[PDB]
Design a protein around this ligand. Structure first.
Ligand SMILES: CN(C)c1cc2c(cc1Sc1nc3c(N)nccc3n1CCNCC(C)(C)C)OCO2
Length: 211
């Protein structure tokens, strides 16, 4: 049911560096995730031009940001192309192995952590603000899956029984206790305005309900 996998060594090392670094400009995580969502939306849109049935699983292309102060979670949800089981357990890490290496070489050479996106490994900037990350994802060609990792060198994959989603990806950030500023409406708005103003899809920030 729940399978556990080891990260490749280079990715484990970058995750430890990110989760333990003293780096104050942590807000870039949201730019990186929104950008990843935007690429996923780009891909399903492009593919649907030659195969319109790929949108049977959902026509709306958007990004939602959903903070939850009770659970202390921030969720980025998109209706992009999603990820398969093969992506989650192996293929993404096969690609990220080289980008993770190049990024850590650049950090040693004096590059900034905010440049992580240029190396194709921006997803891991989520561990600037999160102690655990859960990814619920559904690709047209596969079943709905739940990926999860608290760093420490391993991650799990299981078939997801909640939701379902139709198509797309939810990144659930279980925030560190001292990073709850990223659950506030005004903070999230400021970050999106500064880093994601030109994203070509509707970004809807959900507001929380209790006064
Ligand atoms: C480091 N790294 C790449 C990564 C590792 C992960 C991970 C996600 C990602 S980044 C991401 N976010 C996505 C999203 N929101 N939707 C669909 C796919 C998404 N990918 C994968 C790349 N997509 C490229 C493409 C095909 C869109 C050009 O989850 C567990 O381990």
């Amino acid at each position: 049911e729940v399978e556990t996998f080891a990260f490749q060594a280079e990715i484990a090392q970058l995750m430890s560096l990110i989760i333990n670094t003293f780096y104050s400009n942590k807000e870039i995580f949201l730019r990186e995730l929104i950008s990843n969502s935007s690429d996923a939306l780009d891909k399903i849109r492009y593919e649907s031009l030659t195969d319109p049935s790929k949108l049977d699983s959902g026509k709306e292309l958007h990004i939602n940001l959903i903070p939850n102060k009770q659970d202390r979670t921030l969720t980025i949800v998109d209706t992009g192309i999603g990820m398969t089981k093969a992506d989650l357990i192996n293929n993404l890490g096969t690609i990220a192995k080289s980008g993770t290496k190049a990024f850590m070489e650049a950090l040693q050479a004096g590059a900034d952590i905010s440049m992580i996106g240029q190396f194709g490994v921006g997803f891991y900037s989520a561990y600037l603000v999160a102690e655990k990350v859960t990814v619920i994802t559904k690709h047209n060609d596969d079943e709905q899956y739940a990926w999860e990792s608290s760093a420490g060198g391993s991650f799990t994959v299981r078939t997801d029984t909640g939701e379902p989603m139709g198509r797309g990806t939810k990144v659930i950030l279980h925030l560190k206790e001292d990073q709850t500023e990223y659950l506030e409406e005004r903070r999230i708005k400021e970050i999106v305005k500064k880093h994601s103003q030109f994203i070509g899809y509707p970004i809807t920030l959900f507001v929380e309900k209790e006064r």
